[PDB]
Amino acid sequence: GPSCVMDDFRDPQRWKECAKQGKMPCYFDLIEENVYLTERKRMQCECTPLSKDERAQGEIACGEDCLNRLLMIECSSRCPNGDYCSNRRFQRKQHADVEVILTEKKGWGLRAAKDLPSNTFVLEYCGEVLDHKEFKARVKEYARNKNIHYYFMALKNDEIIDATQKGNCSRFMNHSCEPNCETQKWTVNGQLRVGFFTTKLVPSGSELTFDYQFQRYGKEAQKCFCGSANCRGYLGGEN
Numbered sequence: 001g002p003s004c005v006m007d008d009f010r011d012p013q014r015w016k017e018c019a020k021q022g023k024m025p026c027y028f029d030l031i032e033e034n035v036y037l038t039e040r041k042r043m044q045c046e047c048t049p050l051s052k053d054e055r056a057q058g059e060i061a062c063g064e065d066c067l068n069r070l071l072m073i074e075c076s077s078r079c080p081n082g083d084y085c086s087n088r089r090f091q092r093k094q095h096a097d098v099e100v101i102l103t104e105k106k107g108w109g110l111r112a113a114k115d116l117p118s119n120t121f122v123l124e125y126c127g128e129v130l131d132h133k134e135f136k137a138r139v140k141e142y143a144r145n146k147n148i149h150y151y152f153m154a155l156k157n158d159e160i161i162d163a164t165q166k167g168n169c170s171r172f173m174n175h176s177c178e179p180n181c182e183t184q185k186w187t188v189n190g191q192l193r194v195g196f197f198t199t200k201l202v203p204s205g206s207e208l209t210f211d212y213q214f215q216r217y218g219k220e221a222q223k224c225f226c227g228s229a230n231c232r233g234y235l236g237g238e239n
Ligand SMILES: Cc1ccc(F)c2cc(C(=O)N[C@@H]3CCC[C@H](N4CC[C@H](N(C)S(C)(=O)=O)C4)C3)[nH]c12
Pocket: 139, 142, 143, 150, 151, 152, 153, 171, 173, 174, 175, 212, 214, 215, 216, 217, 218, 219, 220, 221, 222, 235, 236
């Protein structure tokens, strides 16, 4: 099919022109962090600073043993490893090399541009953060408009991320009943964010997918075309 790279979305003019020719997805507002529709001392880890030779050797500053990494909290600028800290991936946009592609029936999708090792950070899922009332309001709005794609993601109690109008290329990852990625909820400056992380080695060219768990709403449920042997048949939660 037709494909495009993440830089292609930085030009709002070349994009809208590309969209008309079915060589890029529909236009949306690109944002680099969540936008809270309604608005609702710090502790650094105890990792030992890495030596000049240790970093050169290929040692990880704030690796698997980091106090913050083990609670899925990112370190701040005030980390003892400073610049070298590998636990600031959201804040530094340390995203994987991914392309936006057209699938057969699922609309647009994400694929690995290179081989992606297991538990690699893909993309932060950014959008407008809604409460339970605002979310339910917009499902009815989107249903009335007769939208085909829905871009809701559960963040926490009374916080749902909506990437329908505003977000980034994370909003193109499709559901699979047998996924190669998962969601991980991460704390940055006392605030919870959600990103996609590989659960296995994704070969270059392979579509990136996660298991979208979300409580179903309404009578009609979207059919699943993920093509897996164990396909649940529909997107979301049991009922
Ligand atoms: C981020 C992401 C990745 C991959 C995915 F597959 C998804 C899917 C969603 C998503 O937001 N789905 C919506 C959840 C709320 C209920 C929505 N229903 C759809 C039909 C029904 N009617 C219009 S109705 C009222 O006519 O029954 C309402 C579906 N997000 C995804």
